[PDB]
Amino acid sequence: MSTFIGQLFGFAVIVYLVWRFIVPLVGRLMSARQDTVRQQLADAAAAADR
């Protein structure tokens, strides 16, 4: 039952690598898209009341 521990260390380093490199950029991307559509709805309401 020692391959379990080795694979678990492998899984730990791979999840550390993803949480370090990948999740920041994808978070930034989805946040940029979120704020873009937010601004779109906001100026839609603005043009309506205008």
């Binding site: 779109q40 839609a44 043009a47 309506a48």
Partner: protein, 57 residues
């Protein structure tokens, strides 16, 4: 589909709003110039029949 229709409706709303904005001053001037040409219709018919009565008297 809804979001694209929304952005298109927003563009059209801005355009129509600015167009109605211009049409505001447009029709305001149109109405007041109709009014002043109606006014200038008077003060000449008055001058016309004033001249007529002055000459007939």
């Amino acid at each position: 589909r809804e979001r694209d229709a929304m952005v298109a409706k927003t563009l059209a709303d801005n355009k129509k709003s600015d167009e109605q904005f211009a049409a505001a001053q447009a029709d305001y001037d149109e109405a007041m110039t109709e009014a002043r040409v109606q006014a200038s219709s008077l003060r000449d018919n008055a001058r016309a029949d004033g001249r007529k009565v002055i000459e007939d008297a």
